[PDB]
Design a protein around this ligand. Structure first.
Ligand SMILES: Cc1cccc2ccc(N3CC[C@H](C(=O)N[C@H]4CCO[C@H](CO)C4)C(C)(C)C3)nc12
Ligand SMILES: Cc1cccc2ccc(N3CC[C@H](C(=O)N[C@H]4CCO[C@H](CO)C4)C(C)(C)C3)nc12
Ligand SMILES: Cc1cccc2ccc(N3CC[C@H](C(=O)N[C@H]4CCO[C@H](CO)C4)C(C)(C)C3)nc12
Ligand SMILES: CCCCCCCCO[C@@H]1O[C@H](CO)[C@@H](O)[C@H](O)[C@H]1O
Ligand SMILES: CCCCCCCCO[C@@H]1O[C@H](CO)[C@@H](O)[C@H](O)[C@H]1O
Ligand SMILES: CCCCCCCCO[C@@H]1O[C@H](CO)[C@@H](O)[C@H](O)[C@H]1O
Ligand SMILES: CCCCCCCCO[C@@H]1O[C@H](CO)[C@@H](O)[C@H](O)[C@H]1O
Ligand SMILES: CCCCCCCCO[C@@H]1O[C@H](CO)[C@@H](O)[C@H](O)[C@H]1O
Ligand SMILES: CCCCCCCCO[C@@H]1O[C@H](CO)[C@@H](O)[C@H](O)[C@H]1O
Ligand SMILES: N[C@@H](CCC(=O)N[C@@H](CS)C(=O)NCC(=O)O)C(=O)O
Ligand SMILES: N[C@@H](CCC(=O)N[C@@H](CS)C(=O)NCC(=O)O)C(=O)O
Ligand SMILES: N[C@@H](CCC(=O)N[C@@H](CS)C(=O)NCC(=O)O)C(=O)O
Lengths: 148, 148, 148
């Protein structure tokens, strides 16, 4: 199998796919909140679900959208950086640590966001998860630059 | 050519590039709607196009932005999942079907969204397109996990 | 090193990683603006930073979010298109030019957006940067289609 193209690749693919699934979970939760709170973004949706007054904003729907947006601001860059980093021959354990810190930090971020946990818990989880991303980005920069 | 690195890859690259172009079409439509409805997001834009009163929201611009955001929530994960899945040696026809269902579902989603089609047409197209994404994600999970 | 899998790859990886870092800079700036203007998105954040009245919108925070969103609408597609394009055996100089126009255009876009530069400076930088993206997308389409 081509999953063994590099020793770090299986770990990267596991963490990254779990994070994609975690984003899908946020999308599904958002839909559930829209239904339960009757807060739809579109008149056509609202008319099917009780009337035009249900095309409206809701603070919990907005919170779900913020968590999903923050995921897009961070997880998408990781999918790129982690893939490239997997092929730079990093120490297997060190690579695993980078991916695991990102995975745990991001899952914790969504829990802290949707769970409305006290500040600065969410901010700390965000920062933690970005650390391995910064590390991988710098490593890629050096490797790319030196091959120019 | 390296497009033949796997039998499923050409189909994946065709569908994924068409979807990127489809996102670009949404960006261009959004700009056209801003101009036609004189609804700009920035004072500097509004002042060039008739006055400060034209820095304002518009329901059709907001709808375009929702479609584009939903694209980012779904097409970007597909670009990752479909690329990896192409290298897991899937049945060629089965892979083609996964990519085609996603392509058709997503094009239909944008038509249903921007066309203001009755509910639940958009919701159904969304769900349809996510099915092959869930399928690919699970397959990647098993392949990655078993190589740990 | 696997960075030399294709002659264009090091240049692509350099430009793409710099652009990811540039997105991270926008995220950090956004946080600084939230703090300085006391405009937080969440009640839990506001209560830590002076009171519930500080959960509020701010035009500069909104502008930062627009720049970051526009980045997600454009840089993420580039990460995909440029990666694939690097493996289609393009002329090295021509490829470098595609990546450099995108890099310069996007950095200029963020400067024009956050700097509130007069129209149509931002719109021009956006258009410039999209040109190589359109070019790469078409090239990928032909290469993928002909291998079906
Ligand atoms: C992400 C994902 C991944 C994998 C599979 C997925 C399958 C479905 C799926 N949806 C997202 C939530 C969405 C939703 O709840 N929308 C509500 C608001 C508008 O009105 C709707 C009709 O009443 C209900 C749903 C169930 C229609 C489709 N998402 C998926
Ligand atoms: C996505 C894509 C892909 C490939 C090539 C592309 C080329 C351009 C291009 N734009 C997106 C729409 C955008 C727009 O219509 N903005 C209006 C609102 C603000 O004010 C503007 C100046 O009056 C008009 C435009 C034409 C300036 C640039 N997009 C592209
Ligand atoms: C992108 C990136 C890349 C690499 C490393 C990074 C490290 C941190 C980092 N943050 C983004 C900005 C964010 C922020 O300023 N938020 C303010 C608003 C809410 O309240 C906060 C607590 O008072 C302050 C911060 C510093 C907590 C975390 N970003 C990073
Ligand atoms: C990957 C998806 C993670 C979902 C985490 C959801 C955490 C929800 O947690 C809940 O949050 C509520 C406030 O929103 C509180 O009232 C509840 O006490 C708490 O259980
Ligand atoms: C604001 C703090 C966030 C930045 C986190 C820095 C991550 C450190 O990253 C490290 O950088 C070194 C020098 O480039 C490299 O030699 C290491 O391989 C890399 O792990
Ligand atoms: C990939 C881009 C797909 C663009 C699909 C646009 C569909 C527009 O469709 C139009 O929608 C209008 C309401 O918005 C209706 O008034 C019109 O009858 C209908 O033709
Ligand atoms: C809520 C319903 C959405 C989930 C769609 C499930 C997609 C099924 O996906 C299937 O999963 C099987 C078991 O892992 C695998 O053996 C198959 O290869 C895979 O196609
Ligand atoms: C990659 C990050 C680029 C950051 C570019 C920030 C440009 C800020 O530029 C500043 O903009 C202000 C208005 O916002 C003006 O008042 C100042 O004159 C100007 O210096
Ligand atoms: C609206 C204008 C934006 C579109 C920019 C067009 C970019 C041109 O792209 C070119 O297309 C040719 C034909 O497919 C190819 O032969 C070239 O390799 C490619 O560089
Ligand atoms: N887009 C972000 C940029 C900065 C950021 O990502 N901050 C982290 C830590 S405070 C966060 O969880 N932001 C909440 C959010 O993005 O909604 C924002 O507006 O806050
Ligand atoms: N961000 C989405 C998450 C759920 C979702 O993607 N739902 C689909 C089917 S109802 C959709 O088309 N949502 C419209 C949208 O994202 O604006 C939302 O707010 O609805
Ligand atoms: N989502 C974009 C789509 C069109 C676009 O990307 N336009 C460029 C050039 S005018 C832009 O800088 N838009 C500003 C923005 O996205 O906030 C929008 O709403 O304008």
């Amino acid at each position: 199998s081509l999953v063994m193209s590099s020793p770090a690749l299986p770990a990267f693919l596991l963490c990254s796919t779990l994070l994609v699934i975690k984003m899908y979970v946020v999308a599904i939760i958002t839909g559930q909140v829209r239904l339960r709170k009757k807060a739809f973004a579109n008149p056509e949706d609202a008319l099917r679900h009780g009337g035009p007054q249900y095309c409206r904003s809701d603070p919990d729907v907005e919170r779900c959208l913020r968590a999903h947006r923050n995921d897009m601001e961070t997880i998408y860059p990781f999918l790129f950086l982690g893939f490239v980093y997997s092929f730079l021959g990093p120490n297997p354990f060190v690579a695993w640590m980078h991916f695991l810190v990102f995975l745990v930090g991001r899952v914790a971020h969504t829990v802290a966001y949707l769970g409305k946990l006290r500040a600065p818990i969410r901010s700390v989880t965000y920062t933690l998860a970005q650390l391995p991303c910064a590390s991988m980005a710098l490593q890629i920069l050096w490797e790319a630059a030196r091959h120019l």
